[PDB]
Structure 1
Amino acid sequence: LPSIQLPVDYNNLFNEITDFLVTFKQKGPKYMAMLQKVANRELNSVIIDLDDILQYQNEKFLQGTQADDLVSAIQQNANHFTELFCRAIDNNMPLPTKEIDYKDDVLDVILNQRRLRNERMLSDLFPPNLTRRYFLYFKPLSQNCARRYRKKAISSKPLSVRQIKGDFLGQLITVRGIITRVSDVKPAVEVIAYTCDQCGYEVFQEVNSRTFTPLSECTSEECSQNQTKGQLFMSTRASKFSAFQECKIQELSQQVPVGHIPRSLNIHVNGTLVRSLSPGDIVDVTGIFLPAPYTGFKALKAGLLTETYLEAQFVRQHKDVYNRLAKSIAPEIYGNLDVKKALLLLLVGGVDKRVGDGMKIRGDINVCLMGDPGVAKSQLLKAICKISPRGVYTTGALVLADNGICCIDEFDKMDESDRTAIHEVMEQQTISISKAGINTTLNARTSILAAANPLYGRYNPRLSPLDNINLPAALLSRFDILFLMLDIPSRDDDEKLAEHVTYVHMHNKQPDLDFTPVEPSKMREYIAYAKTKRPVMSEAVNDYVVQAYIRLRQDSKREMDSKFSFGQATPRTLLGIIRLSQALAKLRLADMVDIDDVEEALRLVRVSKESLYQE
């Protein structure tokens, strides 16, 4: 074990840490107050701000009593400084100011009795981590503070998984990425307490590894002296445990080089930081990059190759009304007012579903878009899915869409099994799993947004609407509203479309200037408010709806006498009409359903299909 002479003196650094804890001010000292709070059981986590250390160093240098660079020493090797800071805190822990029930704690009684036994023996001891009731974390050095004092902040500089090499091991670094996996919280053992059946004494063991060998034989003075062979038995009541969570962080798309596959890095979370990371959130995890040595035969067989993980220390989390909302849904596309209004109605989905007789009318205003290629079906899908809080985008996921709209693209190309799945979702609003492995049933009251293409790829006027649609007629009937979109050539419309697209391409902004789009945040919170609202309908509006229903039924029968009609009106069309009226009433923020809402719903129903079919 040859020795080296390194330019670090841990005694001076410990004195520096103690002075910083005792004297630093930013009232009394900040960290002294924090320790006072910890003593009274008010705080269970202490965070050391490297900015405070840098400021203290600057003040000491200004005063002329230049001291060692503590920030750099902490950054270069943080594992030792955690223990150093813990020792410094322990040596200066203030006496509690609020009386507490000491006898309640098992550890207090056990240590008091150990003291009594030791006093008796003398008349004829425990690890410091055992009694610690706090956790220590390091907050990285802020870039602003470092630039103020003319210093480089390595710890707070974001890095990708690739940029974390072997030369960064043992340092305090930050990682930017997206969490892809988080495990369940489990107890990690740090100190193990044993008992002697014969002796009556308590033994302790410190665990700092993946694995440990339990004790078997008593080591007490009494046992040794008396020659009594006493067996040691584990006691989980007096042991010390810390919450443990293992997470995976993956590279962002913009960080991967050309022609490379993303990489992932493990993260270890201990103490009160648990539950601070969830899948799908982009985070700036600051921690100590450390290796994870193997043990036993694995150690010998592995070789010099070492695994690595990150000890989490800090986590930074990254971030006329109808017409206006419709136009602001997707400004980039050419004006399609009716489709946008239908999308609003689907999104809000207002309904009163409280029949209570055994079933309840479906509470989802499902929308299906079918049209020849060229219309911006993908753009509507993506925009409406982005705005929705529970919107899920899939290509021909339902669980994530529960109690929310489902954004399904390439609906016609979907396999028959998924067709049956969505059929169950609509008719029953339930998700059922019947497998040997597991059998779970999850309710799914989720709306569906469907985009499909005709059988021949483009709509054929000669063929009937049903012929152009590959899906079963029952599925089409179950859809509350069906919108048919077509691309009819025309000089004026084509010229405006070309001008709009060209302006968007050039200036990277919306060409329209007649009106200013409403802010998306306002629109989404208004939608949430409308959803929270509950409307109500009277008997007169019920009779009006009945009259509209008989008129629509007669008209639809007459139309279906010919082959042009999509399908005959059915009580399902009724229920859809009332659902749309309830959604519009929710929009209006007025409890009573008005005749205007019913008329608007009827005109929307007419223009969804007939307006384009007649053309």
Structure 2
Amino acid sequence: ALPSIQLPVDYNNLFNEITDFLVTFKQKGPKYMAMLQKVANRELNSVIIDLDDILQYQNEKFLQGTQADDLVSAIQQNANHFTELFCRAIDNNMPLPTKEIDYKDDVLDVILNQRRLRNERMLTELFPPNLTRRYFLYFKPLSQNCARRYRKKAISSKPLSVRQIKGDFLGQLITVRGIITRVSDVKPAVEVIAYTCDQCGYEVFQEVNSRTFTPLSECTSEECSQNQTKGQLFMSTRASKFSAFQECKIQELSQQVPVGHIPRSLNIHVNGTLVRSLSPGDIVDVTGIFLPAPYTGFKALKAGLLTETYLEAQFVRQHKKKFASFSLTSDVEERVMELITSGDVYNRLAKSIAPEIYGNLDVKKALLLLLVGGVDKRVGDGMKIRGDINVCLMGDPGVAKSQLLKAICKISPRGVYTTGKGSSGVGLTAAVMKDPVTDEMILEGGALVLADNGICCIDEFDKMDESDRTAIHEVMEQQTISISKAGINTTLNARTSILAAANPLYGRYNPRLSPLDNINLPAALLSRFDILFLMLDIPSRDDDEKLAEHVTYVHMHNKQPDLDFTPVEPSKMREYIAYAKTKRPVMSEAVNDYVVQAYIRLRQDSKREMDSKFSFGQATPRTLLGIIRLSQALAKLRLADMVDIDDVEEALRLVRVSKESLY
């Protein structure tokens, strides 16, 4: 039949040591008594056990010649059995409730009390403990400094990659590291399944741990056990016990993949209160149990010994970074006090964005004014006004406008970079097309990538086809996206700033009429944009010399040079942009005459647009709207709830300098 082998592990002494540790441990008295007491009062919902506590307790008790074996090693070599032992030990020593309980809400306990008041009145079934349990058992991996405290190599941890895990690690406790890409929804799963027995005394119970379940047909009720049936047993949803279930997969990082290889994947299961503790697109290090899963679910009658494997989550560190929604704290309050004491700030912020690229202060100032936003939140009668600024960058190849775009995208949490094709699921369609395993065809219809309060950045703005160009024509001026294909009208409220970088298809500027170059795009789209800035490469010794010296000094140090002098830091301005957006100044009336006469002189300029050769000086009311928005932004970025005429003057100078690059 089954031959037997001898192992140096016997569970009785281990269980006794577990009970002794759980009762006697001193880190308030015993921690493990206080937490169990809070569990008894229906306050706590999960149990976490620190293996470092067990290790240090055993190490300090080894000073007396009583201990004989180690338990953390057995935990590492096997975990699920010790989970069962821990829950048995906890249920054995569960304390009394020292607090009052709202006892009427526990419908499961009310039902069980009714069942008992039935059965024991006639003088009863021993219900399994897992049905009555309310807590969850979780583990916590050791810490490397704790291992260094002693000579022994009780290490664990060591966040192996997905591909570095091999077949002999099954059953142990391991830690993985990677990026989360897919997270499924929350779905309830059964733990104990109960059947009602049609008034035939006790209601038969059943317990299943496999992923496949089979129901009952006949019951052991005494009158049902009689020679003829008494009612057909039915499954009752109220009496049974459930548990939240969620599954995800994790991808290997691009750093850890050996050259010439494709990254692998790893499924992960999470149950209990840890559900919804992770989101797609973050770097984490999960600790859990590596378990096998039968291949019989596919039901091919093949793979006689081949089986699938998955990880069971126990503890996760979210890692990465936190945006925190600029939650107010004292430290950042003194930081903004320092910024206020710093005086004029916008020039420093412009200097501090991209020191790698030399000069180009106007574009950095424009980006800073863009990061705050223009006037928004509507006007009287409901007329639409959009606070996002639409600026386009013109320049020949080799000006590092793409590098500056990458810098602004990295430093802005809402930035997104797109381009003409290359990837198809980025424009005119959502990312949930034909995604679910059921091919449920989840879709919103007409939508873009994070178009709400986003910063869309595009390189080669002349490259994309008619579809994306029509998409931009739909997004013009915060207009909603209303493209329908199958009766759907779930429009996405697009409110985003537009960042466009492109070049004339000749790749260089020309002495002839400048609108002939423009963007090789319709003029209607061009008139939409708020600020047009041209970067023309002019061969000059006194400027190219400085540019070359700066670039070679950057290269020589293999780091950012000390040649730059920026008191501000990228995270510093990351906090300050949110701080300045929070202040939100409102408009003032005394500038209406000034802006009206400025618009009159702009129309005077339009009277001379036929002079040609830089014909971009055309007539548009959106020019007045844009100058108003830019004055609002020039009041927003640094000033308090006040709009100054100097803001209008600075906006006018910005417009003039933007036109000046034409020559």
Category of TM-score, reference length = shorter chain: over 0.9
* Percent identical residues: 100
Kept after mapping to 1: 8 A contact 2:605/2:617: no
Q: Which runs of 5+ in 2 are unaligned?
A: 320-343, 420-445
1-side partners of 2:43 and 2:146: how far apart?
Answer: 30
**Deviation at residue 347 of structure 1 after TM alignment:** 1.2
**Deviation at residue 153 of structure 1 after TM alignment:** 4.6
Q: Deviations over 1:129-173 (max 9, x none)?
A: 101100101101111111112333553111100011111111110
- The 3-state SS of whatever aligns with 1:299 is coil
Kept after mapping to 2: 8 A contact 1:408/1:451: yes
- Say if 1:299 and 1:273 are closer, same or farther in 2 by CA, change over 3 A: farther
2-side partners of 1:49 and 1:42: how far apart?
Answer: 20
- The 3-state SS of whatever aligns with 1:205 is strand
What is the 5 A alignment of 1:65-214? 65-122=66-123, 125-214=126-215
**Deviation at residue 552 of structure 1 after TM alignment:** 1.5
Q: Deviations over 1:369-427 (max 9, x none)?
A: 11001101111101111111211112299332421211112211111110110111123
- Say if 1:28 and 1:433 are closer, same or farther in 2 by CA, change over 3 A: farther
**Deviation at residue 226 of structure 1 after TM alignment:** 6.5
Q: Deviations over 1:192-234 (max 9, x none)?
A: 1110114142121112011101112222234224643431111
**Deviation at residue 336 of structure 1 after TM alignment:** 0.8
2-side partners of 1:315 and 1:123: how far apart?
Answer: 42
**Deviation at residue 466 of structure 1 after TM alignment:** 4.0
**Deviation at residue 539 of structure 1 after TM alignment:** 2.9
Normalising by structure 2, report the TM-score: 0.89
2-side partners of 1:123 and 1:193: how far apart?
Answer: 16
Match of 2:388 in 1: 364
Q: Deviations over 1:332-374 (max 9, x none)?
A: 1101110100111111113134224343122211111110011
1-side partners of 2:154 and 2:636: how far apart?
Answer: 53
Equivalent position to 2:610, from 551, 554, 560: 560
**Deviation at residue 257 of structure 1 after TM alignment:** 0.4
1-side partners of 2:125 and 2:210: how far apart?
Answer: 39
1-side partners of 2:489 and 2:124: how far apart?
Answer: 67
- Say if 1:146 and 1:612 are closer, same or farther in 2 by CA, change over 3 A: farther
- Say if 1:454 and 1:296 are closer, same or farther in 2 by CA, change over 3 A: closer
Range that drifts further, 124-133 or 369-378: 124-133
- Say if 1:50 and 1:123 are closer, same or farther in 2 by CA, change over 3 A: closer
Kept after mapping to 2: 8 A contact 1:349/1:365: yes
Kept after mapping to 1: 8 A contact 2:515/2:616: yes
- The 3-state SS of whatever aligns with 1:404 is strand
- Say if 1:560 and 1:210 are closer, same or farther in 2 by CA, change over 3 A: farther
Kept after mapping to 1: 8 A contact 2:186/2:246: yes
Kept after mapping to 1: 8 A contact 2:246/2:271: yes
Range that drifts further, 213-222 or 487-496: 213-222
Kept after mapping to 2: 8 A contact 1:536/1:591: yes
- Say if 1:111 and 1:67 are closer, same or farther in 2 by CA, change over 3 A: farther
Equivalent position to 1:514, from 548, 561, 564: 564
- Say if 1:230 and 1:573 are closer, same or farther in 2 by CA, change over 3 A: same
2-side partners of 1:384 and 1:353: how far apart?
Answer: 25
Q: Which runs of 5+ in 1 are unaligned?
A: none
- The 3-state SS of whatever aligns with 1:241 is strand
Q: Deviations over 1:491-518 (max 9, x none)?
A: 1111111111111111023335362341
Kept after mapping to 2: 8 A contact 1:60/1:67: no
- The 3-state SS of whatever aligns with 1:83 is helix
**Deviation at residue 280 of structure 1 after TM alignment:** 0.2
- Say if 1:221 and 1:101 are closer, same or farther in 2 by CA, change over 3 A: farther
Kept after mapping to 2: 8 A contact 1:179/1:281: yes
Range that drifts further, 422-431 or 269-278: 422-431
Range that drifts further, 34-43 or 294-303: 294-303
- The 3-state SS of whatever aligns with 2:414 is coil
Q: Deviations over 1:73-106 (max 9, x none)?
A: 1111111111111111000100111122434423
2-side partners of 1:40 and 1:561: how far apart?
Answer: 85
Q: Deviations over 1:177-200 (max 9, x none)?
A: 000000001101101111011414
Q: Deviations over 1:284-325 (max 9, x none)?
A: 01110001114478274342111111110010122x211100
- The 3-state SS of whatever aligns with 2:517 is helix
1-side partners of 2:363 and 2:645: how far apart?
Answer: 22
- The 3-state SS of whatever aligns with 1:151 is coil
Kept after mapping to 2: 8 A contact 1:195/1:234: yes
Range that drifts further, 485-494 or 58-67: 58-67
Normalising by structure 1, report the TM-score: 0.95
Q: Whose helix fraction is larger, Structure 1's or Structure 2's?
A: 1
**Deviation at residue 438 of structure 1 after TM alignment:** 4.5
CA RMSD of aligned residues (A): 2.1
2-side partners of 1:548 and 1:490: how far apart?
Answer: 35
- Say if 1:150 and 1:426 are closer, same or farther in 2 by CA, change over 3 A: farther
**Deviation at residue 23 of structure 1 after TM alignment:** 0.7
- Say if 1:162 and 1:230 are closer, same or farther in 2 by CA, change over 3 A: same
